Amino acid sequence: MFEARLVQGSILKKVLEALKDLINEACWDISSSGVNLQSMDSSHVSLVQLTLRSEGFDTYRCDRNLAMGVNLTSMSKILKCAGNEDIITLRAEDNADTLALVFEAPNQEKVSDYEMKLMDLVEQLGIPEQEYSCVVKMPSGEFARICRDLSHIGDAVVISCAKDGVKFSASGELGNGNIKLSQTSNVDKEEEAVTIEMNEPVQLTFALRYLNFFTKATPLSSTVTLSMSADVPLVVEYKIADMGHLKYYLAPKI
């Protein structure tokens, strides 16, 4: 049996909006350690990997590795049906075809009970731990801004990282753009710095549609870590507040 009690319900809501618009169905693997989701989009060009740790929930119980296939749009609806202060409780049976979401209000004046249908289911790729050429840790909001803006110019982005800083470049039927972010020194809050860790300069080409798909998780973290190496996909990593991590993988262009 699976049963989790989450007090920060908004968190989970946010996660679904970071996934709802990119992937339809997903296979949640629940184990005594926590929840793990790993799936590609309909075009097999990107890959989402969510990790939520059992130590981040108010109450966690998992016995056998459970593999529940859920449609994230329906889950996003049912979770948007929750109150901002409601205590959320997820539950599932060992041989079940339904996951139960129980929104419990404080004081107990209202109690909502939704039962979401599951499905069978799933393909899970093996990402070996790697060392990346360039690793840029920057503000989430600046990255989302840059992505949308450069999306107004063209659809592809040339990210070029070097020890002093990163540069994003686009070209379209109305001109060319080149935004340049420099490694910030003497930044007070470490949430608003641009830190670069370089091993060898990098210059990769990525699709902007999927980058703007990724930027939906911006409310989850104030910082994002891009990890890139020549001929290898880009890793956009958002850290969930002391509870897990969301990983977007994007294949380069040509």
């Binding site: 590609m40 075009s43 097999h44 060009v45 990107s46 890959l47 790729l125 093996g126 990402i127 699709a207 290898v232 996909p233 993988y249 994007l250 294949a251 380069p252 262009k253 040509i254």
Partner: peptide, 9 residues
């Protein structure tokens, strides 16, 4: 475009 597979595996 490369599709993530190609890799990864």
């Amino acid at each position: 475009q490369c599709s993530m597979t190609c890799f990864y595996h």
